[PDB]
Amino acid sequence: XXXXXXXXXXXXXXXXXXXXXXXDNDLSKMSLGLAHSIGRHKLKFVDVMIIQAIALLDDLDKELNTYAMRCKEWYGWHFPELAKIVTDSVAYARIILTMGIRSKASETDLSEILPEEIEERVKTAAEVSMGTEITQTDLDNINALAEQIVEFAAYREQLSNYLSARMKAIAPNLTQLVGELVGARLIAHSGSLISLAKSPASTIQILGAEKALFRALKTKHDTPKYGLLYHASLVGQATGKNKGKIARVLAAKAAVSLRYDALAEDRDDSGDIGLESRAKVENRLSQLEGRDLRTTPK
Amino acid sequence: SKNDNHIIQAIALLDQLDKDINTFAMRVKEWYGWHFPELAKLVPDNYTFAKLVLFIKDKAXXXXXXXXXXXXXXXXXXXXXXXXXXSETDMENVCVFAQRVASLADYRRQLYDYLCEKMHTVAPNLSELIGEVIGARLISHAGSLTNLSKQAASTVQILKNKGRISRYLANKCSMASRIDNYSEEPSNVFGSVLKKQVEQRLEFY
Amino acid sequence: KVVIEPHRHAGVYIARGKEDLLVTKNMAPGESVYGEKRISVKVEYRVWNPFRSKLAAGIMGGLDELFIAPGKKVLYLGAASGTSVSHVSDVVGPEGVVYAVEFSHRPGRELISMAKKRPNIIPIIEDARHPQKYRMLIGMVDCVFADVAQPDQARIIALNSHMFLKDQGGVVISIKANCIDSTVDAETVFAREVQKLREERIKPLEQLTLEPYERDHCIVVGRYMRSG
Amino acid sequence: NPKAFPLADAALTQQILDVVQQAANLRQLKKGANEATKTLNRGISEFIIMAADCEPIEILLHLPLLCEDKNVPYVFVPSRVALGRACGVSRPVIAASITTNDASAIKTQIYAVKDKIETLL
């Protein structure tokens, strides 16, 4: 059929006014959802999804220890000494399941969880320990805390797995450069990816521990050198005062890497520029440890 | 035997579970807001909302566990008119988080049971006069049961009502923790007998 | 302590304190469109930016009848990052809505996520040159506001004037001087645009100059007659 | 580079780097994008000069985003070694930042060339 045009202005306006009688926030909110799909499809595919993952992850380390003190202190009425010999929480949550009672202790061997030094130690802890027997009613949620902490560790592995993969998704070169947990904490103190990408190199240094920075700014003191970049996988790989200057060098190359990741529309998503940076950072480190401040006599 | 240590351990765990699971439910709810934020007002039940987050992994019709019957249809007709974004591996790890919300709420539920059971074992006069919640938290409130008995009726505090009933109910619950402290085998009948003296005064209230 | 004052229109407000401020009630607790501040006086209130939103600039400049009213539904064009559409929704409240239009692709996700949290904002990413590309979504608006960067802002606002204007409804157009002439003085361009805007059934009521908020902006208040 | 938003011509780049060549000689000039983001933060930047052929060029693109935020003029000059030599540095420089002082010797030499860059928008 033919199509008529050049005069549909008033007719389109009039049936648009009739659709307002068809009505008003509900139809226009279905139109809002229309715009929500058609625009979110349009300009991308974020900064916000990764920033509560790090808050959850930092809550997980605290939550493991503050359930782990409960895990020992509920088990010191059966084994006071088993708190002191093995100190890691996942071995304790495994060793409620693995040791069992003191009669099941000497029978059950420990090739999986702390062997060959601590097997003798738990066999010497089983024979003398000043705690009591604990009943089968008691081994219902003592017995279940031991697998709850195990599942908390497994969920922490899912947290680290998702953080590590999505770091390669969002920031492919910086998380090829400095490490991914700093790769979370830097955006965490930043906020947006742009909020760090608009932050200069000297703010990639002192992003976290900025008190002594401010004690250096207003009191006449001296700033930290390392900052939140201390715990990254490359600053501690030096020694001594050499760990100071490298705190610039990564924070330099981070600005070269983050803005390669936060500001490139065509992108390999493959970590090269970050590795091109990290090769030179390692080369500055290898030239830096080459020097020695001693006297080298002939 | 007759121990009071496990009750304090169970309560000291339960408070952190009650600070853990609802927190992780708000975390999962913040995550699912980038897939379906609309269901969380229709389904605020944070265990069963983390069952329905666990249930329909992608969008939406023909539902079974959405009702087990108005919230099922109210979620299906809302999930048809979708508002948020959409990916998959993020959604999978987030569903694993909602699974941990489910398992941790289940562990809190199993903690509740053995808590009330060790209550009913060791302190039945504390669980009959009041109930296992206030009674099991009471032996944390003194730190231990032997520090409940040496406390007075005035020195202990619980929750015209506050001046009278929080003193006289404290009297009988202290006297309940007495016969729970020094008996070898405590009874459930005289907990209700000392409950009934609060019952006459409370019918007078 | 803090004095909270009704501005010359309903919906808008004014903080008198240590410093004077133009302020506006917040629809949702605790979220920002662009990182802006807030104040509890308890009732929530948010400072507007006349330097960033030309609507707030005509609001602080002294203008008689801005047609954005708490009862009414208002159209917007040129929503650069949505700097105004939360302000229009918070000045109309829930009974009124803002139907926003923005065609540039880079900053529109903040408008989308702003309509995600405050229900009065509705978005448009369809094209405004041919306005019947978003014919399906809005119908028969009361008053319009314009912030696009095309030279035919008179004609593109005419192409929305022949569609969405309520007959005997008002219209405010925020005109920048740079898109059209950019060398000759702004008033000889504003009389030219008034001559062109009377050609499409808007008879102007007021002309207003943003002197300390913009360099040579304007807003034209008129009332569109006899069509819609 | 299609991300070259305004890359100046041969002519205006000469005067821009002339203001650079004099701006180091009053020490009225900071050099480097990392220092440029500090000068823009403390606002004493007159304008921000960018190079175009450095690899990768994305490592400075936050500064046009920043100079739209603070409303500071900016341009793209073609090559980094020119920028470094006009800054008086032996090194290549991707970005220069002219510091503000109303009493320095080249001040109107700022403003007329600055109004050049302010023409370009």
A9 reaches C (C-beta below 8 A): yes
Contacts of A40 in chain C (CB under 8 A): 109, 112
A11 reaches C (C-beta below 8 A): no
Is A162 within 8 Å of B90 (Cβ atoms)? yes
Is C74 within 8 Å of C144 (Cβ atoms)? yes
Q: Pick from C140, C155, C167 the residue to mutate for testing the A interface (most A CBs within 10 Å).
A: C140
Tokens 């979110």 correspond to A40
Q: CA of C50, closest CA in chain A: separation in Å?
A: 24
Q: CA of A20, closest CA in chain D: separation in Å?
A: 40
A136 reaches B (C-beta below 8 A): no
Q: Report the candidate in D39, D26, D31, D78 with the shortest Cα–Cα distance to residue D57.
A: D78
Q: Spell out the long-range contacts of A182-188 with Cβ–Cβ below 8 A and sequence spacing 24 or more.
A: A182/A228, A182/A229, A182/A231, A182/A232, A182/A233, A184/A50, A184/A51, A184/A53, A184/A54, A184/A57, A185/A54, A185/A228, A186/A228, A186/A254, A187/A47, A187/A50, A187/A51, A187/A54, A188/A51, A188/A54, A188/A55
Size of interface A-D (CB pairs under 8 A): 38
Q: What is the DSSP letter of C84?
A: T
Q: Spell out the long-range contacts of C35-38 with Cβ–Cβ below 8 A and sequence spacing 24 or more.
A: none
> Can you tell me whether residue A107 is helix, strand or coil?
helix
Size of interface A-B (CB pairs under 8 A): 71
Q: What is the DSSP letter of A118?
A: H
A30 reaches B (C-beta below 8 A): yes
Could you check whether the bond before residue C107 is cis, i.e. omega within 30 degrees of 0? no
* Nearest-by-Cβ selection for A162 from B9, B90, B117: B90
Residue A122 corresponds to which tokens in the numbers above?
A: 């738990």
Residue D22 corresponds to which tokens in the numbers above?
A: 């004099």
Decide if B6 and A77 are in contact by the 8 Å CB cutoff.
Answer: yes
Contacts of A140 in chain B (CB under 8 A): 110, 114
* Nearest-by-Cβ selection for B117 from A45, A137, A166: A137
List of residues 6+ apart from A242 with CB closer than 8 A: A285, A288, A289
H/E stretch holding B199 reads helix B189-204
Q: CA of A174, closest CA in chain C: separation in Å?
A: 24
Compute the distance between CA of residue C193 and CA of residue C195 in angstroms, rounded to an integer. 5
Contacts of A171 in chain D (CB under 8 A): none
Contacts of B27 in chain A (CB under 8 A): 52, 56
Contacts of B83 in chain A (CB under 8 A): 32-33, 36
* Resolution in Å, one decimal place: 4.3
Is C190 within 8 Å of C145 (Cβ atoms)? no
A217 reaches D (C-beta below 8 A): no
Q: CA of A190, closest CA in chain C: separation in Å?
A: 13
Domain extents for chain D? 1-121
Percentages helix, strand, coil for chain D (3-state, rounded to 5) are 45, 15, 40
CATH superfamily of D1-121: Ribosomal protein L30/S12 (3.30.1330.30)
Contacts of B20 in chain A (CB under 8 A): 63
Q: CA of A265, closest CA in chain D: separation in Å?
A: 9
Q: CA of A39, closest CA in chain C: separation in Å?
A: 6
Instruction: Provide the residue type at A251 as one letter.
Output: A
Compute the distance between CA of residue D85 and CA of residue D13 in angstroms, rounded to an integer. 13
Provide the chain A residues 182-201 that lie in CB contact (below 8 A) with chain B.
none
Contacts of A17 in chain C (CB under 8 A): 139-140, 228
Method of determination is cryo-EM
A275 reaches D (C-beta below 8 A): no
> Can you tell me whether residue A133 is helix, strand or coil?
coil
Q: Report the candidate in B17, B94, B81 with the shortest Cα–Cα distance to residue B53.
A: B94
Strand arrangement, sheet containing C39-40: C3-6, C12-16, C21-24, C44-47, C39-40
Instruction: Determine if residue C173 is left, alpha or beta; phi over 0 gives left, psi from -120 to 50 gives alpha, anything else beta.
Output: beta
DSSP lists the bridge partners of residue B27 as none
Residue A164 corresponds to which tokens in the numbers above?
A: 């590590």
Q: What is the DSSP string of A24-62?
A: -HHHHHHHHHHHHHHHHHHH---TTTTHHHHHHHHHHHH
Chain D neighbours (≥3 Cβ pairs under 8 A) are A
C71 reaches A (C-beta below 8 A): no
Is D110 within 8 Å of D19 (Cβ atoms)? yes
Is A38 within 8 Å of C137 (Cβ atoms)? no
Crossing angle for the helix pair C85-92 and C108-115, nearest 10 degrees? 20
Other Cβ atoms less than 10 A from the Cβ of A140: the count is: 17
CA geometry: angle at C218 spanning C49 and C196, to 5°? 145
Q: What is the DSSP string of D110-121?
A: HHHHHHHHHHT-
Decide if C97 and A44 are in contact by the 8 Å CB cutoff.
Answer: no
* Nearest-by-Cβ selection for A155 from B85, B96, B107: B96
* Nearest-by-Cβ selection for A36 from C112, C138, C162: C112
Decide if D61 and A263 are in contact by the 8 Å CB cutoff.
Answer: yes
Decide if C97 and A17 are in contact by the 8 Å CB cutoff.
Answer: no
Instruction: Provide the residue type at B172 as one letter.
Output: K
Q: Report the candidate in B97, B192, B185, B181 with the shortest Cα–Cα distance to residue B144.
A: B181
Tokens 């019709």 correspond to B61
Compute the distance between CA of residue C91 and CA of residue C11 in angstroms, rounded to an integer. 4
Chain C neighbours (≥3 Cβ pairs under 8 A) are A
Decide if A31 and C106 are in contact by the 8 Å CB cutoff.
Answer: no
> Can you tell me whether residue C174 is helix, strand or coil?
strand
List of residues 6+ apart from A41 with CB closer than 8 A: none
* Nearest-by-Cβ selection for A273 from D56, D60, D65: D56
Is C36 within 8 Å of C49 (Cβ atoms)? yes
DSSP lists the bridge partners of residue C144 as C75
Compute the distance between CA of residue B177 and CA of residue C205 in angstroms, rounded to an integer. 84
b/e per residue C36-63 (b: at least 16 CB within 10 A): eeebeeeebbbbbbbebbbbbbbbbbeb
* Nearest-by-Cβ selection for A263 from D34, D37, D58: D58
Q: CA of A193, closest CA in chain D: separation in Å?
A: 11
> Can you tell me whether residue B37 is helix, strand or coil?
coil
